[PDB]
Amino acid sequence: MPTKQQLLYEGKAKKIYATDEPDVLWVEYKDSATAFNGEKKATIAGKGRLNNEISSLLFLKLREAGIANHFIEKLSPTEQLVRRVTIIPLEVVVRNVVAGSLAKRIGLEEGTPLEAPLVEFYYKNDDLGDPLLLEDHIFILKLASREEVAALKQAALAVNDVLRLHFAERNVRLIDFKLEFGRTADGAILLADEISPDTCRLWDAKTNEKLDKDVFRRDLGSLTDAYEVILQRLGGE
Amino acid sequence: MPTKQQLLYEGKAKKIYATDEPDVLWVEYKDSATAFNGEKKATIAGKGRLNNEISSLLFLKLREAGIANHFIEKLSPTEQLVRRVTIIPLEVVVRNVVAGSLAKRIGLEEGTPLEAPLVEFYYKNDDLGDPLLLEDHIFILKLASREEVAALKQAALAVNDVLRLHFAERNVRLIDFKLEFGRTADGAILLADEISPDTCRLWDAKTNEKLDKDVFRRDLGSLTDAYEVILQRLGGE
Ligand SMILES: Nc1ncnc2c1ncn2[C@@H]1O[C@H](COP(=O)(O)OP(=O)(O)O)[C@@H](O)[C@H]1O
Ligand SMILES: Nc1ncnc2c1ncn2[C@@H]1O[C@H](COP(=O)(O)OP(=O)(O)O)[C@@H](O)[C@H]1O
Ligand SMILES: [Mg+2]
Ligand SMILES: [Mg+2]
């Protein structure tokens, strides 16, 4: 029962519309794919639906698990309603295994194990290439307080506990993932954006087949065929 | 470690080979589909793998739940090892909802509910069209004793309890299914044969989409695409 109103913002993957309710937003997932800081792009038919549906499922699982988030309800195969927040410009990354950009940064082979989950912070500024930030840099930038950063790390690790187990029970290894959080008018914080194969590195527990955006980044095959596997492992739409 | 030996029997869906172990059989699932008492047939690439993998998963779930069965271990994407039994010539059917042949028999629309699961016995004799049998007919034929029939009913309902729930947790409605049981040398009975979309009627809980052999019977689309959904809902191979 909102209704989609004027467009407020259009990013690389989704369109953000305002609704008749001031603190409710209408999110539309596009059938667009991007990689390598936007250097690689393409239209992927059906991608928006897959990510909207998967994101819906994962946020609902988080809600059931007691993890605060902005997801309100799914609206269509490609759209969903969420709580409006003012995003803290940080990409909060959790890595359970060494892979992707981290593997490249330290020169280690993907799959290298970690003693415990690693939390990394990246500046959400595409013009700057979303550079890695030391926590001290966050305070220099005044992006968040020391207590907020500590809370974000705790929140991200809580998300990891829930999702890592959820995926493992479904024969999927949650290698790493990226989260975004936002502030409410009263200063409260809620997990926001998206949680999908675009934002999570997922390997099949048996074959180690890649079922995430790496499929597009490295041209490993059909991106939607891979994402469909995840959707069904999660129980379907 | 048994090794595949001579072919003992080839049915309409699988090939049964003997192994170096007298009480162990080697089952190979074929890429063939049949319907309407063998009146409709076709080769379906990949079907054998899907049924072998799904059957493996379901028998393993049954084993975990404490339900005795002949499944030993999966051998390849299309083959599996099982305990040899002498099959009781009965197709034990459990129906949770009215559909398929039952809907046709009583002239009711598919989907009509039942107060409790219904157990039906069919004579496993394709030359006779696998006719429905009253329990009294079973005794006339001397196929099984009254105590065995009672035990088979209990066993089938126990399988329904476990599988109905397992599928429901994965957004799949187990509409009905057919089982086969066999006797060991000492008179013990084990659930045998197969448990797959070929032998189970499965509807998606949300869309009621048919994800079983009805897809082939009624030409509703790709049979393997439908079966793949079930495989992934169950956690993948
Ligand atoms: N609940 C929310 N309230 C306000 N902004 C949000 C919320 N969740 C996500 N966003 C923002 O909406 C955008 C999502 O689109 P994309 O993810 O397509 O944008 P980018 O392309 O990330 O800017 C991001 O800028 C993200 O920070
Ligand atoms: N564990 C088992 N031991 C011996 N026979 C079995 C066992 N499980 C199934 N069978 C039989 O093997 C055959 C399976 O192939 P299909 O299912 O292709 O045969 P039909 O085509 O049903 O005879 C059936 O006749 C079935 O009754
Ligand atoms: Mg984004
Ligand atoms: Mg058979």
- Which atom belonging to ligand 1 lies closest to the Cα atom of A12? 21
> Residue A90 maps to which CATH number?
3.30.470.20
CB atoms within 10 A of CB B35: 15
DSSP codes joined into one string, B203-221: EETTT--B-STHHHHTT-S
To one decimal, the resolution in angstroms is 1.8
Residues A132 and A204 in one domain: yes
Q: Name the experimental technique.
A: X-ray
The runs of H, that is alpha helices, within A15-128 are 47-64, 100-106
Chain B nearest-CA distance from A232, in A, is 5
Query: Which residues, 6 or more positions from A146, have their beta carbon under 8 angstroms from its beta carbon?
Result: A139
Query: Is there a single domain that holds both residue A228 and residue A203?
Result: no
Residues B96 and B58 in one domain: no
Exposure class string for B198-223: b at 16+ Cβ within 10 A, else e: bbbbbbbeeeeebbbbbbbbeeeeeb
A33, A41 Cβ separation under 8 angstroms: yes
Q: Which SS3 state, helix, strand or coil, does residue A102 take?
A: helix
Q: What type of residue is A27?
A: V
Question: Is A123 marked as binding a ligand?
Answer: no
Question: Are B93 and B204 contained in the same domain?
Answer: yes
B200 in the same domain as B111 = yes
- B135 and B211 share a domain? yes
Report the CATH number at residue A49.
3.30.200.20
| Cβ contact A171–B204 (<8 Å) | no
Check whether residue A102 and residue A193 sit in a common domain: yes
Q: Extract the tokens encoding A3.
A: 């209704």
C-alpha span between B124 and B131 (Å, rounded): 8
**Whether residues B120 and B48 fall in one domain:** no
CA distance A172 to A59: 17
Helix, strand counts (H, E) of chain A:
6, 14
Nearest in space to A148 (alpha carbons), one of A135, A159, A161, A157: A135
Could you give the residue ranges of the DSSP H alpha helices within A31-185? 47-64, 100-106, 135-141, 146-169
With CA atoms as reference, report the closest residue to B216 among B9, B41, B57: B41
Q: Return the exposure string of A80-97: e unless at least 16 CB atoms fall within 10 Å of the residue's CB, then b.
A: bbbbbbeebbbbbbbbbb
Write the CB contacts of B153 (distance below 8 Å, at least 6 apart in sequence): B92, B119
Within 8 A of A235 by CB-CB distance, chain B residues are 170-171, 233
Question: For A210, which DSSP code?
Answer: B
Phi/psi at A140 (5° precision) = -65, -40
CB A168 within 8 A of CB A204: no
Regarding whether A96 and A75 lie in a shared domain, the answer is no
Query: In 3-state terms, chain A is what percent helix, strand and coil (to 5)?
Result: 30, 35, 35
**Separation between Cα atoms, residue B142 and residue B125, nearest integer Å:** 14
- What residues 70-129 of chain A have any CB closer than 8 A to a CB of chain B? none
Pairing of strands B40-43, B14-19: unpaired
The single residue listed with the structure tokens 């997801």 is A71
Structural domains of chain A, count = 2
What gap in Å lies between CA A185 and CA A84, rounded to an integer? 10
C-beta neighbour count of B116 within 10 angstroms: 7
User: Residue A57's domain spans which residues?
Assistant: 1-85+223-237
How big is the A-B interface in CB pairs under 8 Å? 27
* The one-letter amino acid at A74: K
Q: Which of B160, B29, B28 is nearest to B92 (CA)?
A: B160
